[PDB]
Amino acid sequence: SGFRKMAFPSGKVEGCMVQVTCGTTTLNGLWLDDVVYCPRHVICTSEDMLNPNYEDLLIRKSNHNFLVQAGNVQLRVIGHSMQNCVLKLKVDTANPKTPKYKFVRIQPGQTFSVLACYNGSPSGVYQCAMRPNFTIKGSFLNGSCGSVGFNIDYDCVSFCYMHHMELPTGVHAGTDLEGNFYGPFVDRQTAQAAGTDTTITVNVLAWLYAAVINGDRWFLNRFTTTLNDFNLVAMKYNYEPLTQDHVDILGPLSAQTGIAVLDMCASLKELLQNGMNGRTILGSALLEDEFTPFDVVRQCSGVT
Amino acid sequence: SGFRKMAFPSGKVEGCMVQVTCGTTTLNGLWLDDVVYCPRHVICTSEDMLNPNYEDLLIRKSNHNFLVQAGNVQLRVIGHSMQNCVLKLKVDTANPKTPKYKFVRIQPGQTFSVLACYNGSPSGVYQCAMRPNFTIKGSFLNGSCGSVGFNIDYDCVSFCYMHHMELPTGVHAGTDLEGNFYGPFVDRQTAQAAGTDTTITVNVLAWLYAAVINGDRWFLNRFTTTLNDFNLVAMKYNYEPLTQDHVDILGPLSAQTGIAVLDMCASLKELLQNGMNGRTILGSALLEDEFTPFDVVRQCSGVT
Ligand SMILES: *C(=N)c1nc(OC)cc(OC)n1
Ligand SMILES: *C(=N)c1nc(OC)cc(OC)n1
């Protein structure tokens, strides 16, 4: 029993973190096979960042200008290329600790672990979600760029995020491992405002199922609702609309607890309308939305 | 910017996790050098657990009854001994991945990372604190015993906790790596009720400093208080008394923000008396107490 905001074990990803320096800029790189992936803004000075022409800036860079260090040892760069907003630095040595891996582009609402790094060295691991406005609420200081987000399926690491940027509102933006930003963000120090950060309804419902499984049941009520009635309330509260696909995804948690998905929607509807009244659910005074239904099943079953 | 409940990178500890089986019971062991540490209740059947005499039960066990598996390979047990509530299984092979390590016994209020494991395999990593009533609020299922809590200082892992038990209220109890339980708990399936779970005042104040550093400042007020006046309010709200040692510990965060510790105490006093009024601090609707002042400095500076 007990339910925590849990990150995947980070060891497989720690073995891939390297330091990348270009000129006076140092950030993190991800070393998989004989390629080091890093944000292309490693080539920018703080001034360049205001309006960078990456193709033009990159012309002034050669393989020997990209200093890649893995632990105490230097890696030899034998090629470099730009793919969207990431640089791929081909090195002469395959990473001996390369885990089984995939590059995946996640959808909003999906969660992942972040291994925050500085100078190619891991500092911490935390769990977060791709917000519906394509930002993430991370913990990143200067030098954390190139830190990655990932999920693990037994022994295969699916890398989904690489840190690039902080918006003036303190939220974060980044790319998948193909260098494509999530959302409309660009790697330029310009006015970039995020859209509405709606709540991930399907994740709140999954977390309410985790609460019932772990003994917090005070919020269960005698009501039911329909998808359309629930969605009228969800729109009022800036919650994402619940679809029949979300209901289907919650099927196993509904089966485990015996609480029909629409009944849990009615409990959530009352929590939105009445508030918590100073009460907590799984140690939280707000409705948590950074656990997917898969995360709840995984944590409640103990998948390794 | 941004502030997350962050765990230490788990790789160094993942390299130490093994599976220990005695008869029909399987749990986790911690393999450091040529010793495997595990809860002594590995020798108990579910019936034995009601009133076990460990010394007597242990007489019926030989080295060959302790099956220790590290990954896919079996370790040879060449000795076994009981130290308090842990067993130390001497194996014939030193763990090649043994990190630099220490065994530390933490005080209430101190935080640590837990690498939850099942069958010697890591499932997740999360951050928690030793509560003032000597319980921890973890996420542990059957088979998670022997999972450990730790802190890291650059390359040295300080192991502080080993999971043994869940109380009927869903909170957890365990030992340090010398086998001594935190608090008054025993490794017996008997009526064990936890005392008052007070809030760790010094940690709430540290987290309010992290909120100011990361831009959440709405709760700052025009008031100040004294330790004695603050402590009258802290007692009313089941908060731990703040001492001059806690004030001294918050000195660097006070210096960084320019907010005197007693002024932050006055902000906390008003938050306790007035509530949050539907507002949040660092994404939380309650006052968070599982970040020590050291954690706040570490996360706000990016220590690797
Ligand atoms: C990422 N490491 C990073 N670091 C900065 O300064 C040290 C600035 C920045 O701007 C995008 N990114
Ligand atoms: C710890 N792994 C554990 N597992 C149990 O059943 C599988 C019971 C238990 O009781 C102390 N501990």
HEC secondary structure over chain B:
CCCCCCECCCHHHHCCEEEEEECCEEEEEEEECCEEEEEHHHHCCCCHHHCCCHHHHHHCCCHHHEEEEECCEEECEEEEEEECCEEEEEECCCCCCCCEEEECCCCCCCEEEEEEEECCEEEEEEEEECCCCCCECCCCCCCCCCCEEEEEECCEEEEEEEEEEECCCCCEEEECCCCCECCCCCCCCCCCCCCCCCECHHHHHHHHHHHHHCCCCCCCCCCCCCHHHHHHHHHHCCECCCCHHHHHHCHHHHHHHCCCHHHHHHHHHHHHHHCCCCCCECCECCCCCCCCHHHHHHHHHCCC
Residue A117 beta carbon below 6 angstroms from any ligand 1 atom:
no
CB contact under 8 A, A118 and B300: no
Name the pairing type of β-strands A172-175 and B121-129.
Answer: unpaired
Closest CB from B6, B11, B278 relative to A139: B6
CB contact under 8 A, A2 and B170: yes
Q: B99 burial class (0-12, 13-18, 19+ CB within 10 angstroms)?
A: middle
CB contact under 8 A, A125 and B6: yes
Closest CB from A9, A214, A275 relative to B124: A9
Place of tokens 């038990």: B165
Q: A177 burial class (0-12, 13-18, 19+ CB within 10 angstroms)?
A: buried
Interhelix angle A227-236/A261-274, rounded to 10 degrees, is 30
Domain coordinates in residue numbering, chain B: 1-14+100-197, 15-99, 198-301
Cross-strand partners of A161: A149
Q: Which of A40, A139, A142, A161 to mutate to test the pocket of ligand 1 (most atoms within 8 A of CB)?
A: A142
CB contact under 8 A, A137 and B2: yes
The dihedral region occupied by B109, where left means phi > 0, alpha psi between -120 and 50, and beta the remainder, is left
Residues in chain A: 304
Judging contacts by C-beta atoms under 8 Å, the chain A residues touching residue B304 are 117-119, 121-123
How far apart CA A155 and CA A284 sit, in angstroms, is 32
How far apart CA A16 and CA A31 sit, in angstroms, is 5
CA A295, A299, A302, B3 torsion: positive or negative?
Answer: positive
Measure CA of the first residue to CA of the last residue in chain A; give whole Å: 17
Spatial CB neighbours of B61, under 8 Å, sequence gap ≥ 6:
B22, B43, B80
> Hey, whose CA ends up nearest to atom 10 of ligand 2?
B165
Judging contacts by C-beta atoms under 8 Å, the chain A residues touching residue B10 are 9-11, 125
How far apart CA B253 and CA B268 sit, in angstroms, is 15
User: Nearest bound ligand to CA B302?
Assistant: 1
Residue A145 beta carbon below 6 angstroms from any ligand 1 atom:
yes
Judging contacts by C-beta atoms under 8 Å, the chain A residues touching residue B118 are 302, 304
Nearest CA in chain B to A128: B4
Nearest CA in chain A to B289: A283
Under 8 Å between Cβ of B160 and B168: no
How far apart CA B117 and CA B152 sit, in angstroms, is 19
User: Could you tell me which of B99, B102, B94 has the C-alpha nearest to residue B155?
Assistant: B99
Under 8 Å between Cβ of A203 and A292: yes
Task: Tell me the two tokens of residue B289.
Answer: 């107490």
How far apart CA B257 and CA B104 sit, in angstroms, is 32
Name the pairing type of β-strands B111-118 and B148-153.
Answer: antiparallel
Judging contacts by C-beta atoms under 8 Å, the chain B residues touching residue A303 are 123
Under 8 Å between Cβ of A144 and B27: no
Give phi and psi for B264, each to the nearest 5.
Answer: -65, -35
Cross-strand partners of B7: A125
User: Nearest bound ligand to CA A163?
Assistant: 1
Q: Do the two domains B1-14+100-197 and B198-301 of this chain adopt the same fold?
A: no
> Hey, whose CA ends up nearest to atom 1 of ligand 1?
A145
Furthest CA-CA distance within chain B: 68
Residues in chain B: 304
The dihedral region occupied by A176, where left means phi > 0, alpha psi between -120 and 50, and beta the remainder, is beta
CB contact under 8 A, A284 and B285: yes
Under 8 Å between Cβ of A27 and A20: yes
For residue B68, what are the CA distances in angstroms to A29, B65, B99, B140? 37, 9, 20, 21
HEC string for chain A = CCCCCCECCCHHHHCCEEEEEECCEEEEEEEECCEEEEEHHHHCCCCHHHCCCHHHHHHCCCHHHEEEEECCEEECEEEEEEECCEEEEEECCCCCCCCEEEECCCCCCCEEEEEEEECCEEEEEEEEECCCCCCECCCCCCCCCCCEEEEEECCEEEEEEEEEEECCCCCEEEECCCCCECCCCCCCCCCCCCCCCCECHHHHHHHHHHHHHCCCCCCCCCCCCCHHHHHHHHHHCCECCCCHHHHHHCHHHHHHHCCCHHHHHHHHHHHHHHCCCCCCECCECCCCCCCCHHHHHHHHHCCC
How far apart CA A24 and CA B183 sit, in angstroms, is 52
How far apart CA B2 and CA A175 sit, in angstroms, is 18
- Which amino acid is it at B248? D
How far apart CA A173 and CA A192 sit, in angstroms, is 10
Under 8 Å between Cβ of A28 and A174: no
Judging contacts by C-beta atoms under 8 Å, the chain B residues touching residue A14 are 9, 11
Residue B42 beta carbon below 6 angstroms from any ligand 2 atom:
no
User: Which CATH superfamily, name and number, covers B15-99?
Assistant: Trypsin-like serine proteases (2.40.10.10)
Spatial CB neighbours of B174, under 8 Å, sequence gap ≥ 6:
B136, B149, B161, B162, B163, B164, B165, B181, B182
Under 8 Å between Cβ of A116 and A182: no
For residue A255, what are the CA distances in angstroms to A230, A247, A302, B141? 21, 12, 18, 20
How far apart CA B166 and CA B139 sit, in angstroms, is 10
Measure CA of the first residue to CA of the last residue in chain B; give whole Å: 17
> Hey, whose CA ends up nearest to atom 11 of ligand 1?
A165
CB contact under 8 A, A117 and B15: no
Measured in angstroms, the CA of B247 and the nearest CA of chain A are apart by: 26
Rg (CA), chain A: 21
Under 8 Å between Cβ of A188 and A50: yes
How far apart CA A205 and CA A216 sit, in angstroms, is 14
- The yes-or-no answer on residue B145 being catalytic is yes
Distance of CA B125 to the CA centre of its chain: 11
Nearest CA in chain B to A11: B11
Experimental method: X-ray
Spatial CB neighbours of B47, under 8 Å, sequence gap ≥ 6:
none
Residue A192 beta carbon below 6 angstroms from any ligand 1 atom:
no
- Which amino acid is it at B236? K
Name the pairing type of β-strands A100-103 and A156-166.
Answer: parallel
Sheet architecture: strand order including A25-32: A73-75, A66-70, A17-22, A25-32, A35-39, A86-91, A77-83
Interhelix angle A201-213/A261-274, rounded to 10 degrees, is 100
Spatial CB neighbours of B111, under 8 Å, sequence gap ≥ 6:
B127, B128, B129, B130, B151, B203, B290, B291, B292, B295
CATH architecture of A1-14+100-197: Beta Barrel (2.40)
Q: Single out the catalytic residue among B44, B145, B160, B265.
A: B145
User: Which CATH superfamily, name and number, covers B198-301?
Assistant: main proteinase (3clpro) structure, domain 3 (1.10.1840.10)
Residue A27 beta carbon below 6 angstroms from any ligand 1 atom:
yes
Instruction: Quickly count: other Cβ atoms within 10 Å of residue A98's Cβ.
Output: 16
Furthest CA-CA distance within chain A: 68
> At how many Å resolution was this determined?
1.4
Residue B142 beta carbon below 6 angstroms from any ligand 2 atom:
yes
For residue A81, what are the CA distances in angstroms to A28, B162, B281? 17, 47, 42
Cross-strand partners of B88: B37, B81
Task: Tell me the two tokens of residue B276.
Answer: 């949050």
Closest CB from A2, A115, A283 relative to B9: A115
CB contact under 8 A, A11 and B11: yes
CA B10, B13, B19, B20 torsion: positive or negative?
Answer: negative
User: Could you tell me which of B102, B106, B100, B56 has the C-alpha nearest to residue B82?
Assistant: B56
> Hey, whose CA ends up nearest to atom 6 of ligand 2?
B142
Give phi and psi for B204, each to the nearest 5.
Answer: -65, -40
CA B225, B231, B232, B233 torsion: positive or negative?
Answer: positive
Task: Tell me the two tokens of residue B57.
Answer: 């039960």
Burial A9-35 (b: 16+ CB within 10 A, else e): bbbbbbbbbbbbbbeebbbbbbbbebb
Under 8 Å between Cβ of A156 and A99: yes
Cα three-residue angle A69-A72-A73, rounded to 5 degrees? 55
Under 8 Å between Cβ of A176 and A105: yes
Nearest CA in chain A to B295: A124
Under 8 Å between Cβ of A209 and A254: yes
